């Protein structure tokens, strides 16, 4: 049966999972949490090991913990390298883009003033720390992909991160020619091109409606700081 | 050559790595960051992909990102299950204890008042969310170990987490009989017993000296909130 993604109708921590499944050409279904009662019913069913989402029903498992879910999908669909060392490189690269996109998780919950500050913080991290690191990886081996000269989860996570940064600062990739070429190549891969196309399950930049729903369902995150 | 752990002379994010290596019976060396100049020299050498530590020199790699390092060690020393699904369970369990211990990372940098609040926050999470979840895993299959009826990284991460919670609230495991038995069994495993014994490389609860050193080296974390 198709994987079922339990989360809010928005990006959050589930977006990277949507990306990986789409990139692997895997059709999935989604169950959106829209009300407090719906969440309480979930808690009572005990299907959320730690009372939290993301949660993905896949291959008989009720998998929680974002990274555990991604690790599983990457491995199942051969996007995790060919051995222990390649997986280590993929994990190291993913850790970097996970931190980068992680700095944007609170963004929609921030005040107008903090959004400006956070945006500057994220762009600075991208241009001074992360983009230089990945540009160097590509420059050092000169291959089209980050690891093993073939598409991996690391490439998919980086493309998503690059797009999120560009949504905040359109010219953020300026000065990183290899990443620019990388962006075009990965975006053209059939499964990925389809995901970036209209009508896909890719979610938009989070808005006030998303925040309102998260707060209504979880009764939390009422005062987020940068 | 033996793995080399680059970090501060204290727990932080490197402690779990020390635990896993010790549990696997692997002898390692440590390089402690004590001065700003030492850190600047590291940055200039480019050995830290994202300008941060933990960093572990192992099998020819300059591995950064805590989870990437742990994933590698767990896999290399057969403490990651026997297949994709067992790894998924291990990752899900580890995610929970990583979050739990993660809530304690800022603790030594907190004010006296915030430490009291944070301690209450952590204990509540342990008794209402995490301990119940792991107690249930053990209860459901009745085996001595969390996954595959053999020692895994998940068991090691949970034991460490249990001990950290008990350091904050000694009777926190009360009401969780299976976890109590689990604590005694895992603590008795030769490699682990040795790590818990005097003279090991296990690090103590972080103190003001640790905080002072982190702030001196990184010139950051000057005002941490709960
Ligand atoms: N470490 C978990 C964290 C999950 C998490 O923080 N989930 C939030 C929603 S984005 C949640 O369920 N919050 C409710 C709560 O913690 O009580 C992961 O990576 O999946
Ligand atoms: N996601 C990274 C985070 C590493 C991290 O936050 N490292 C801190 C020390 S505990 C650091 O190097 N901070 C300096 C900085 O970020 O500039 C990991 O899990 O290893």
Curated annotation (Swiss-Prot), chains A, B:
One of its GO terms (cellular component) is cytoplasm. One of its GO terms (biological process) is xenobiotic metabolic process. InterPro entries: Glutathione-S-Trfase_C-like (IPR010987), Glutathione-S-Trfase_C_sf (IPR036282), Glutathione_S-Trfase_N (IPR004045), GST_alpha (IPR003080), GST_C (IPR004046), GST_superfamily (IPR050213), Thioredoxin-like_sf (IPR036249). The keyword ATP-binding does not apply. Its main location: cytoplasm. Its EC number is 2.5.1.18. PROSITE patterns: GST_CTER, GST_NTER. The keyword Metal-binding does not apply. Belongs to the GST superfamily. Alpha family. Homodimer or heterodimer (with a subunit from group CL-4). This is Glutathione S-transferase 3. It comes from Gallus gallus.
